[PDB]
């Protein structure tokens, strides 16, 4: 009742409970969003309010008191997730699904020319409006808070966009791991259909294995010295983009592959993704909802 009105809850979200709100100065609404419980995650995040473009949810304030932290964030009214499953019967359709996926590599690039990292991109936190916009949400709240090695959330934490380098238990953290999770969601925009839905760690890296084969030290230099590599996985041939995405275009298909590469050192930035020809004829669609 000082500053903000509860108007109502949003739901359980990556880092603890999501309410919509107003603020009582401004009038405007808001995502509060409160951290479920450091002095560095504080300082790490505050600079956040810094990273700013209009493919980033705006972060408007980092509020500690009661020694409870919450987090102030620009409201939009719909995710990805519930976007494709109301979708569902016909597809976004392939101008709007390029749109978006445009809009995120351009969320990306920005944040990744200041060496910032998202870690978590999944379709529940990029948020859509009803002109043809979307927003990467919650973006560098993983480094500040040590996600994904920590856990804040009740749910189960979804496995499905995980790049393999973290699945393997990999020390360093590069720009890779969002082109990776970014590809992953624009096969599922494309099929309707997750691509790597694991529920599991193991059957994460076995759904990837079968599709893309069992990497090597061919195609990922140093793989077989991974922490959590195990001479004894099971080896599968990689399968065809074109059996795996279908009906997407050669140049599509050909980006997909480029965000899906093993090594990370190979995965293509999202600068370079931006020029790719499969965005020649970008537009900027209104979706239907
Ligand atoms: C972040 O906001 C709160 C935190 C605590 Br504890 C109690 C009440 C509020 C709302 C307000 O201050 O209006
Ligand atoms: C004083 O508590 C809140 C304030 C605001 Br704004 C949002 C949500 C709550 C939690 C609750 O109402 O249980
Ligand atoms: C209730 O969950 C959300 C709420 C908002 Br607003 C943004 C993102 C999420 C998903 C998550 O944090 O996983
Ligand atoms: C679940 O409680 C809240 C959630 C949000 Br968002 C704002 C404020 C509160 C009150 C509290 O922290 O007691
Ligand atoms: C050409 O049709 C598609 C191709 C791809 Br890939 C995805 C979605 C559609 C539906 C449409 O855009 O109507
Ligand atoms: C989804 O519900 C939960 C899961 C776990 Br683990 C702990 C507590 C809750 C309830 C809550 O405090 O909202």
Same mark, same amino acid.
């Given at each position: ?20 709100? #107003? !603020?009582?100065?401004?009038?405007? %609404? ?31 304030? %980092? ?13 939009? @009214? ?7 499953? /109301? ?10 699904? *390029? ?16 060496? =910032?990292?998202?870690?978590?991109? *999944? ?5 859509? !409006? ?13 480094? /500040? ?8 959330? @009740? ?36 099929? #309707? ?24 030290? =061919? ?11 195990? &001479? ?11 059996? %795996?995405? &279908? ?13 899906? @590469?093993?090594?990370? !050192? ?9 020029? @790719? &020809? ?12």
């Amino acid at each position: 009742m000082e500053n903000f009105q509860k108007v109502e809850k949003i739901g359980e979200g990556t880092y603890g409970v999501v309410y919509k709100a #107003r !603020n009582k100065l401004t009038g405007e %609404v808001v995502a509060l969003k409160k951290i479920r419980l450091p002095s560095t995650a504080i300082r790490e995040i505050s600079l956040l309010k810094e990273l700013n473009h209009p493919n980033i949810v705006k972060l408007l304030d %980092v509020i500690h008191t009661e020694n409870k932290l919450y987090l102030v964030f620009e409201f939009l @009214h719909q995710d990805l997730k519930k976007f494709m499953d /109301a979708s569902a019967l016909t597809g976004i359709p392939l101008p709007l699904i *390029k749109s978006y996926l445009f809009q995120l590599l351009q969320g990306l690039a920005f944040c990744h020319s200041h060496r =910032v990292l998202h870690r978590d991109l *999944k379709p529940q936190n990029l948020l859509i !409006n009803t002109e043809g916009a979307i927003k990467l949400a919650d973006f560098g709240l993983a480094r /500040a808070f040590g996600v994904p090695v920590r856990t804040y959330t @009740h749910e189960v934490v979804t496995l499905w966009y995980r790049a393999p380098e973290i699945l393997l238990g990999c020390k360093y953290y590069s720009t890779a791991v969002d082109i990776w999770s970014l590809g992953c969601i624009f096969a599922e925009m494309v099929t #309707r259909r997750a691509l790597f839905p694991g529920d599991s760690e193991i059957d994460q890296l076995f759904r990837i294995f079968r599709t893309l084969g069992t990497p090597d030290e =061919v195609v990922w230099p140093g793989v077989t010295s991974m922490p959590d590599y195990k &001479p004894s996985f099971p080896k599968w041939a990689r399968q065809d983009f074109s059996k %795996v995405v &279908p009906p997407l275009d050669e140049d599509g298909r050909s980006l997909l592959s480029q965000m899906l @590469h093993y090594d990370p !050192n190979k995965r293509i930035s999202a600068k370079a993704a931006l020029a @790719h &020809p499969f965005f020649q004829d970008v537009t900027k669609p209104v979706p239907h909802l």
